[PDB]
Amino acid sequence: AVPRRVLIAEDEALIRMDLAEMLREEGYEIVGEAGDGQEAVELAELHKPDLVIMDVKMPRRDGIDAASEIASKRIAPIVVLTAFSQRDLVERARDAGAMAYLVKPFSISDLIPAIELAVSRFREITALEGEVATLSERLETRKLVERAKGLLQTKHGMTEPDAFKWIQRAAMDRRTTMKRVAEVVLETLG
């Protein structure tokens, strides 16, 4: 169901400790703590966690590079911790697969929505991997779904996770595909 087992990767000890504590308080199990980007990739492969939370900057292998590598394996949702002014590094990097950023400094009230966003985007990737037969169709189906999400967000006031969930639940209930639901959202709202 929802993620419980979490790998964290952060070289600053205080952020690491505070993040681990937040997560334990909200019922997560910490299954690893990496302090560099190479260990992060290795542990994600070893332990196959339910969730990865990693800094945008890491020793050895930077967090964005490591995050992109983990994303490409479709192991888990990823939250990338970043200063506000470095958010574009993560924008320029979901080119690689599904992640969300979380601006530091952060509290639990900030972390929980970032996890929800990362989980939603992961579920969208895995749903499209499973539902769409070919890669070329899949790329364009993703773009269509993203447009439909955006319209549901702006026109109906939904969050991004709630917009994707709408599309998924509609497709399931109508016994059709996300592609067809998204196409109709575009027709109606676009």
Side-chain angles (χ1 to χ4, degrees), residues 126-145:
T126 66
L128 290 159
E129 295 288 334
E131 194 166 286
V132 184
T134 71
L135 179 61
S136 60
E137 282 170 286
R138 195 173 306 116
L139 297 170
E140 287 299 328
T141 299
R142 193 177 189 287
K143 288 176 197 182
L144 178 61
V145 170

Side-chain angles (χ1 to χ4, degrees), residues 86-104:
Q86 303 210 287
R87 70 196 183 280
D88 286 337
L89 297 178
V90 175
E91 295 290 5
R92 280 164 74 81
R94 250 212 301 155
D95 258 43
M99 57 193 75
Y101 71 77
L102 172 57
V103 170
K104 300 180 287 172

Side-chain angles (χ1 to χ4, degrees), residues 107-123:
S107 66
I108 265 177
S109 58
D110 301 310
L111 174 65
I112 291 293
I115 290 175
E116 287 167 0
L117 184 53
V119 169
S120 179
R121 287 174 178 172
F122 180 74
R123 185 206 214 82

Side-chain angles (χ1 to χ4, degrees), residues 9-27:
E10 170 64 61
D11 84 293
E12 284 295 341
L14 185 54
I15 295 169
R16 192 171 60 240
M17 294 166 22
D18 288 345
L19 172 63
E21 169 64 25
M22 273 184 210
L23 288 163
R24 284 189 302 261
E25 288 174 13
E26 293 321 310

